Amino acid sequence: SLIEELIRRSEEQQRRNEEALRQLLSGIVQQQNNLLRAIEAQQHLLQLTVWGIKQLQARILAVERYLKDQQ
Amino acid sequence: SLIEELIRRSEEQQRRNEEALRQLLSGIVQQQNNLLRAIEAQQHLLQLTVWGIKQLQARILAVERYLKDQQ
Amino acid sequence: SLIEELIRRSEEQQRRNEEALRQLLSGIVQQQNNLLRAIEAQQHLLQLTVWGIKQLQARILAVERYLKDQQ
């Protein structure tokens, strides 16, 4: 959602820099900061998913071991 | 895969802008659109993974509860 | 972690290009390569998570089928 907010902000600066191409340098540098911030937020969300996956792994493993032990 | 297509397209424009650095402005602005589109596709795929993780969570939880209830 | 290294490197070039804005073109082109490399590493990590999710799916499915078959 913040990712969606940084992406919508990036789409804005892209229209600006495009319409300015049709001054320009500052907006390109600003747009690179917008892209970096999106990438950084996506990395935060990706790190969460990695840990969520490991936790699911541990949970499935516990069930698998339980079923094995029940034999 | 579309991500891989936007990334290969970004690698192309990077060589262009590099070899043009060795006109340039338009390709930098074009390359920023290539990066934004990659980021946006990656966000689509990341959103899918988030929902896939939640669904796995619900599935494991149902199994855990079943095993608990079977006692 | 490499993602964190490409992102910290991107944050450096952003300060350079900002402080140079306050020559500039080369650093913008360099910064676009930094962003592309971050995006590409994130795509590698995202592809891993996708496969990790599929494998968890197969594992949960095997447990679900086992419990079904035990009836």
Curated annotation (Swiss-Prot), chains A, B, C:
Top-rank taxon: Viruses
Function: Acts as a class I viral fusion protein. Under the current model, the protein has at least 3 conformational states: pre-fusion native state, pre-hairpin intermediate state, and post-fusion hairpin state. During fusion of viral and target intracellular membranes, the coiled coil regions (heptad repeats) assume a trimer-of-hairpins structure, positioning the fusion peptide in close proximity to the C-terminal region of the ectodomain. The formation of this structure appears to drive apposition and subsequent fusion of viral and target cell membranes.
Compartments, record wording: Virion membrane; Host cell membrane; Host endosome membrane
Subunit-structure text: The mature envelope protein (Env) consists of a homotrimer of non-covalently associated gp120-gp41 heterodimers. The resulting complex protrudes from the virus surface as a spike. There seems to be as few as 10 spikes on the average virion.
Location of region: Immunosuppression: 54-71
Topological relation to the membrane, as annotated: Single-pass type I membrane protein
Organism of origin: Human immunodeficiency virus type 1 group M subtype B (isolate HXB2) (HIV-1)
Protein name in the entry: Transmembrane protein gp41
